Amino acid sequence: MKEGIHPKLVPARIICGCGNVIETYSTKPEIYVEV
Amino acid sequence: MLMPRRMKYRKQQRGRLKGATKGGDYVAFGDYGLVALEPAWITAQQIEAARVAMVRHFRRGGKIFIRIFPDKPYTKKPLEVRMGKGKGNVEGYVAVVKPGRVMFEVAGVTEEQAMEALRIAGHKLPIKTKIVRRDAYDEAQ
Amino acid sequence: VRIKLLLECTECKRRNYATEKNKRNTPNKLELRKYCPWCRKHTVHREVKI
Amino acid sequence: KFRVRNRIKRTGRLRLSVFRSLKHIYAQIIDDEKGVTLVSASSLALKLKGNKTEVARQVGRALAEKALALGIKQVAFDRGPYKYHGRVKALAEGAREGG
Amino acid sequence: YRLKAYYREGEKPSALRRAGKLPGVMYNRHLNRKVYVDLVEFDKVFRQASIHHVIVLELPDGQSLPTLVRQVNLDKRRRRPEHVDFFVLSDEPVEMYVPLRFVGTPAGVRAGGVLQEIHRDILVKVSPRNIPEFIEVDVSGLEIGDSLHASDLKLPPGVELAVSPEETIAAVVPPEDVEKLAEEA
Amino acid sequence: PLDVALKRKYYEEVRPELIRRFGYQNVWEVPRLEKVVINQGLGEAKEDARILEKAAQELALITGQKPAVTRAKKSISNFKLRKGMPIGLRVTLRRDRMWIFLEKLLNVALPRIRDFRGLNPNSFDGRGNYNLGLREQLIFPEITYDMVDALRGMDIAVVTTAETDEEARALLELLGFPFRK
RNA sequence: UCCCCCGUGCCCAUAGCGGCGUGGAACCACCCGUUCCCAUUCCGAACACGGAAGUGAAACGCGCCAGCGCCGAUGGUACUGGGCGGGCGACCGCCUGGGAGAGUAGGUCGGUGCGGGGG
RNA sequence: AGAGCGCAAGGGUAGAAGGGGGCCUGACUGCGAGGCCUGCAAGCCGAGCAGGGGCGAAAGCCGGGCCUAGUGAACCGGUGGU
RNA sequence: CCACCAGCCUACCAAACCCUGUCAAACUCCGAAGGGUCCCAGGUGGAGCCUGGGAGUGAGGGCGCGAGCGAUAACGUCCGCGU
């Protein structure tokens, strides 16, 4: 994705309710959910 | 009777009628048949008349087919008017039929039955007709 | 129709003309189109009169 | 799909029928009508260089010479998907006068 | 079966017909000459024929060869044959229309019912090596509203086909009476 | 290259099971991934301005992109909106990006859903594609109650080089798509 | 002279559909990176700038099959200049010249010139 | 090509006339070869020249709108100029 | 006769396709006769071309086939080629 007003990217995690430690790369830095 | 209930033009010009049938003298439908003799219009009035008289005479009879269709507007002017001022009107809803054309046909009947039936039927019609079998008609689609 | 009406365009820099139409109804405030006068080359042109 | 005949907006007068394809660059200058070509110049389909944009430059100019030897003046860059990233050889210096 | 034939010259058909000989044409592969036959026995033999049976034409040219029909143009005016085409016979999978003899008198039939004589003559690609005579059609169990079509017919072991096959060869329809005065409405 | 969890597993895990069971002796014919576009086209953009597209842009915001407000076509007099400039929120995802999309999808977005019985096993196009919809917007991780208004489900559209049911299906199951049964 | 392919023009469906087979050694194409030129109302799809490994599926080129598609003679007939009767008319005949489509036989998946590279 | 191309139909058109964006403003001046049409009158068509101008990398288009309806000779005078 | 939603049937109604035939001034895949025009050629006639003076003419009628209209009636009215 090019442009310049693109809401960027940067890595994110997933501190699930189980203890899961997933590594993602989307829009929002602090991601953590359920399973 | 029957006709289109809203086709195109409420009025269309009568026409010149010579001859050729245009095609439509064979079968694929009925065993016995009635073919026209003179180039003319045939009224849906006369049409449903033949329909009647026919099915009428042979009650409980089989199916009868009509290859033809009464899709012509008679232009009728009102009674005791005067010339010009306008034109006729959507009256007399008839079919163009030229000699050779099979108006109508029967199947499931008897020999004598089909005979007398188409006999009286065509007798009604505003001309004269020919009663026919089903042989050489084989093939023409 | 007079709603689109009929107006003409004169140059600045003293007079000049060219024949045109309008459309007051449509977002048409005033106009400073760009045409040619009888004298010299292409220039301004200002909107005026009936 | 870029037919349109940009070639029809080039039916004007005198042609330069080519195509750009992965490796080689097929720069041709073509007498139309009978479709009788004339002046060709390519990437390594001319045995010159391996870089399309470099080649272009040199090639156009090489092509120029060829053109000018047969008494050649002006045509028009023929391609639908041409886009004109120039390849500022752009067969313009390259004899044609170009642009 | 047997019938006479004569080579045409090129005289205007007006004369030919005006006499008593029906003018017609024959051909095979690339040959395409012109001929004529004699009406009365020709009309006769053709009743027993058409494209369903097979014609033989003995010819005063030291050769006596057979054909099947094809395309019979008529007069329109006054109804009768005026011209016939004849395709010469061979041995290679020929396509034409085999008669379908309707056998059976079931539920549609009996309890009223009229058959739908749609395809006596049906398109099959049978090798002229073989000659299917009269294909049987199993009507032995049909009802009004129900039909017969497709492969339901007899495919004589030496007869292929390529119509649809979905084409309804026959069906049953209801009888009419004074109950059409009800429709008269 | 942007190596996520399912992309790496795709590299490794796909070639074994797929090539072994399915059998594809062509290095490049082997029908894998393709365009994954997302679409949330309402019909409520009767008007409400691009304050109504404002809630549509928040959607592309969650995937990490900016979208295209493609629209209608006709003059529906019944439920308003003639001409055709309302809502048909649409954005395209390819390679790496698509990857993180499906990542957030089956890692955390799937779990939630309250009627998450099992992924609909009947919604196959039969040409190597797989369309489907859903009730809640917030099912996806990065969106919590702070923005939501009422209801805004989506229409996930996905295409593959695939052409038949089983290839795309087991593709999905080697990329983490637990179906119904 | 010629063989294959690429850039190309010309015939205007007998040249198109599709089914199949086959090539990548120079090509073509997908491919490959998205920093550089550049763009997408969103997407490196598209256009791009730069390019090694691979590949010949998908793109394509060449073939085979008529199933679909298209072309369609040859006979006759329609209808018609011009000339001539017959009918109350609706209309019908005859000579001389012109001569269709309908379809049957069959035909057909191609015809071709300019430039360029390899042998 | 059954869509669209304002408006009735007809012709036509996706090798654009249709639909999206950028710069603009040739609904330009002085002229007009030679043709349509036609009783007169009026109406229709236009290469090129020349000023200068917009856009175009160029080749080039531009004397409004895809075309056919949206029009009123003269006498009277209104208004700006020469 | 069920619901997470479906089945099933008829001498029913009917969008579409297929066949079976079909109609048509304002439908038209094809398309005649013919008519049109320019080119070469013949053709000497109260032909033709150019300008100039003088007119009359502008309700026409009938028949022939081609079409309207009337009722495929009128010594009907309206056109056309033809006389």
Curated annotation (Swiss-Prot), chain A:
| Protein name as it appears in the record | Large ribosomal subunit protein bL31
For this protein's source organism, the top of the classification is: Bacteria, Thermotogati, Deinococcota, Deinococci, Thermales
Family per record: Belongs to the bacterial ribosomal protein bL31 family. Type A subfamily.
Part of the full-length chain shown: 1 to 35 of 71
Where along this sequence does the record place binding of Zn(2+)? 16, 18
Write down the species: Thermus thermophilus (strain ATCC BAA-163 / DSM 7039 / HB27)
**Oligomeric and partner information:** Part of the 50S ribosomal subunit.
Role description: Binds the 23S rRNA.
Swiss-Prot record, chain C:
Instruction: Write the record's keywords in alphabetical order, separated by commas.
Output: Ribonucleoprotein, Ribosomal protein
Cytoplasm as UniProt keyword? no
The record's section on SUPFAM superfamilies has:
Zn-binding ribosomal proteins
Q: Which terms under GO biological process does the entry name?
A: translation
Tree of life domain: Bacteria
Keyword field contains Ribonucleoprotein: yes
A GO molecular function annotation here is:
structural constituent of ribosome
Q: List GO terms (cellular component aspect).
A: cytoplasm; ribonucleoprotein complex; ribosome
The record's section on Gene3D superfamilies has: Ribosomal protein L33
Family membership noted in the UniProt record? Belongs to the bacterial ribosomal protein bL33 family.
This chain's protein is named Large ribosomal subunit protein bL33
Task: Identify the species of origin.
Answer: Thermus thermophilus (strain ATCC BAA-163 / DSM 7039 / HB27)
- Record gene name: rpmG
From Swiss-Prot, chain D:
Question: What are the recorded Gene Ontology BP terms?
Answer: translation
Which branch of life, at top level?
Answer: Bacteria
Which Gene3D superfamilies does this UniProt record tie to the protein?
3.30.420.100
CDD domains hit by this protein? Ribosomal_L18_L5e
Q: Which UniProt keywords apply?
A: Ribonucleoprotein, Ribosomal protein, RNA-binding, rRNA-binding
Recorded GO molecular functions are: 5S rRNA binding; structural constituent of ribosome
One of the record's GO cellular component terms: cytosolic large ribosomal subunit
Q: How does it assemble?
A: Part of the 50S ribosomal subunit; part of the 5S rRNA/L5/L18/L25 subcomplex. Contacts the 5S and 23S rRNAs.
HAMAP family from the UniProt entry: Ribosomal_uL18_B
Q: Relate the protein's function as given in its record.
A: This is one of the proteins that bind and probably mediate the attachment of the 5S RNA into the large ribosomal subunit, where it forms part of the central protuberance.
The family this protein is said to belong to: Belongs to the universal ribosomal protein uL18 family.
The entry's protein name is Large ribosomal subunit protein uL18
Question: Which organism was this protein described from?
Answer: Thermus thermophilus (strain ATCC BAA-163 / DSM 7039 / HB27)
List the gene name: rplR
Swiss-Prot record, chain F:
| Gene Ontology MF term list | rRNA binding; structural constituent of ribosome; tRNA binding
Biological process GO terms, please?
translation
Looking at the UniProt entry, the stretches that span the membrane are: none
- For this UniProt record, give its keywords in alphabetical order, as a comma-separated list: Ribonucleoprotein, Ribosomal protein, RNA-binding, rRNA-binding, tRNA-binding
Q: Name one GO cellular component term.
A: ribosome
Organism domain of life = Bacteria
Q: Which Pfam families match?
A: Ribosomal_L5, Ribosomal_L5_C
Q: Could you say which protein family the record assigns here?
A: Belongs to the universal ribosomal protein uL5 family.
Function recorded in the entry: This is one of the proteins that bind and probably mediate the attachment of the 5S RNA into the large ribosomal subunit, where it forms part of the central protuberance. In the 70S ribosome it contacts protein S13 of the 30S subunit (bridge B1b), connecting the 2 subunits; this bridge is implicated in subunit movement. Contacts the P site tRNA; the 5S rRNA and some of its associated proteins might help stabilize positioning of ribosome-bound tRNAs.
Per UniProt, subunit arrangement is: Part of the 50S ribosomal subunit; part of the 5S rRNA/L5/L18/L25 subcomplex. Contacts the 5S rRNA and the P site tRNA. Forms a bridge to the 30S subunit in the 70S ribosome.
Name recorded for this polypeptide? Large ribosomal subunit protein uL5
Organism listed in the record: Thermus thermophilus (strain ATCC BAA-163 / DSM 7039 / HB27)
Mind giving the lineage of the organism this protein is from? Answer: Bacteria, Thermotogati, Deinococcota, Deinococci, Thermales
Name the gene behind this protein.
Answer: rplE
